[PDB]
């Protein structure tokens, strides 16, 4: 596709196909002049037909095994696109068996290939978007939890809070680190890495702020109003960064 593929995985899978189609176009109908006979494609086309039914078999297993309602809705259209593109290639092989110089066959070869590239592309992006929603759910779960920081007023409730928040932050940090590495857009990787580091370094500051508050609200004298401000600031700065993470996780020029 004209745009860079979204992730390195999708890139390593489709880049070679996109390039080979360009070469085909340059060589054929939108290129030089190959009124030269194209060999029999019956075999290589049947192999595609088999690879297509395999992909669709795996894809359907995903649809009836996923909880993501969007994934269920968006994948079938891609099956149709790939299957329909395949039908043009089968037709191209037929025509070429009858006439190696068939012009319609050449246009079908190009359209069918583009169609399979496009359908496989949509299919992988739908999966990738489902994958990203999983990360956003973990991120929103931490947002929700930071929201209950207000409640903690006991030295033991603080140890309990920390007990949960610790792991959650670890899971999110790992998902973001692995996700950022898959991006093909550097500026997007940096934003995720910087936001994550900001949220990461603020975790101790938050815990330290809640402890100051608790030990404060368990010992007389007014140092309480203050303790309250820094805890709230932290919870806001962390939440803001996590929201920025959620935003960047969804950025795309498509692919």
């Amino acid at each position: 596709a004209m745009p860079v593929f979204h992730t390195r995985t999708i890139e390593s899978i489709l880049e070679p196909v996109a390039q080979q189609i360009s070469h085909l176009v340059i060589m054929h109908e939108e290129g030089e002049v190959d009124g030269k006979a194209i060999p029999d494609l019956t075999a290589p086309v049947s192999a595609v037909q088999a690879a297509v039914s395999n992909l669709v078999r795996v894809g359907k297993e995903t649809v009836q095994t996923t909880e993501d309602q969007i994934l269920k809705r968006d994948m079938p259209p891609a099956f149709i696109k790939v299957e329909n593109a395949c039908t043009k290639l089968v037709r191209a092989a037929q025509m070429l068996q009858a006439d190696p110089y068939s012009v319609p066959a050449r246009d079908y070869l190009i359209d069918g290939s583009r169609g399979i590239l496009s359908g496989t592309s949509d299919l992988l992006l739908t999966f990738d978007e489902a994958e990203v929603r999983k990360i956003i759910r973990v991120c929103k779960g931490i947002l929700e939890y930071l929201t209950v920081a207000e409640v903690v007023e006991t030295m033991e409730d603080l140890v309990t809070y920390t007990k949960n928040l610790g792991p959650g932050m670890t899971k999110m940090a790992k998902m973001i680190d692995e996700r950022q590495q898959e991006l093909t857009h550097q500026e997007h990787r940096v934003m995720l890495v910087n936001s994550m580091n900001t949220v990461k370094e603020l975790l101790p500051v938050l815990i330290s702020a809640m402890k100051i508050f608790v030990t404060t609200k368990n010992t007389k004298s007014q140092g309480i109003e203050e303790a309250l401000k820094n805890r709230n600031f932290t919870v806001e700065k962390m939440s803001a960064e996590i929201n920025e993470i959620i935003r960047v996780l969804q950025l795309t020029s498509w692919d």
Partner: peptide
């Protein structure tokens, strides 16, 4: 979650092979 990715790589490979065979 990679069975879908492997199915896709397989199709990608098959199309690449087709385009290579189409070269006259």
């Amino acid at each position: 979650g990679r069975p879908l990715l492997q199915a896709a790589k397989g199709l990608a490979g098959a199309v690449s092979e087709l385009l290579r065979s189409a070269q006259p």
